[PDB]
């Protein structure tokens, strides 16, 4: 995160780290939705253009993490994957449309103070909250400027109107996509950056005080840049795919 801020302990007990075995390093961010399922960007696992093709036997999930680099000894939980499911329609080809993937843990995780599931939106929460001018929160261990933080970073970005989002890039935006950031003439700033992908875009319901993941860090052309914005997978819209693979397996 850029122009972000260290995260308070147990602020996002759902944030998960995608970490590869050989070689041991950070791949992306992810999210805990249930005890055996994890959400993330499909591009964290499949990006043919960069010869990226990870498979369960190449991945491990780290849940309960605050510190980026260290092995948080009695807090964090490491888990192995049983299987990866990628939106059959993930468009790695053109504009990362349907950039969503679900991962299945070989064994479920016991929840605690640092490990806890985030809520998936519902048709009304999304209608109430996915409003332009409203703010969401982004977390991740990604580059600190367009660099690596010691601790999880955080930031609050408003939802930018469709047009504006559209008028900021050469890429082709879809309906399964939203953008967020402050408009250059508003003093404040901040963004998502490389390493933060698969990372959640939550909001707090003013109705039930629950936190809902609304987006997934998807893409953006450079970090914190005037007249530019961050793009996130619109999760409610892909909701129905989620349930599917969840009801099947």
């Amino acid at each position: 995160i850029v122009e972000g801020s260290d995260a308070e302990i147990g602020m996002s007990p759902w944030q998960v780290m995608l970490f590869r075995k050989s070689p041991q390093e950070l791949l992306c961010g992810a999210s805990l939705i249930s005890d055996r399922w994890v959400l993330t960007a499909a591009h964290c696992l499949l990006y043919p253009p960069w010869d990226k093709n990870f498979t369960e036997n190449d991945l491990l999930v780290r849940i309960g993490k605050h510190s980026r680099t260290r092995y948080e000894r009695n807090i964090e939980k490491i888990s192995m994957l049983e299987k990866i499911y990628i939106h059959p329609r993930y468009n790695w080809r053109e504009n990362l449309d349907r950039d969503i993937a679900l991962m299945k843990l070989k064994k479920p995780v016991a929840f605690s103070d640092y490990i806890h599931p985030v809520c998936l939106p519902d048709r009304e929460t999304a209608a109430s909250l996915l409003q332009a001018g409203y703010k969401g929160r982004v977390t991740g261990w990604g580059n600190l400027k367009e660099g690596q933080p010691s601790v999880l970073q955080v930031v609050n970005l408003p939802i930018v109107e469709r047009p504006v989002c559209k008028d900021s890039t050469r890429i082709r935006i879809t309906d399964n996509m939203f953008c967020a950031g402050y408009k250059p003439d508003e003093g404040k700033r901040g963004d998502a950056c490389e390493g933060d992908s698969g990372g959640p875009f939550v909001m707090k319901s003013p109705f039930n005080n629950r936190w809902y993941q609304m987006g997934i860090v998807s893409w953006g052309e450079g970090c914190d840049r005037d007249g530019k914005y961050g793009f996130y997978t619109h999760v409610f819209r892909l909701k129905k795919w989620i349930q599917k693979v969840i009801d099947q397996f």
């Binding site: 970490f19 041991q24 390093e25 950070l26 491990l60 680099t69 260290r70 092995y71 490491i78 690596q148």
Partner: peptide, 7 residues
């Protein structure tokens, strides 16, 4: 590497 060995 910048990372701490895992069990």
């Amino acid at each position: 590497g910048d990372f701490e060995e895992i069990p």
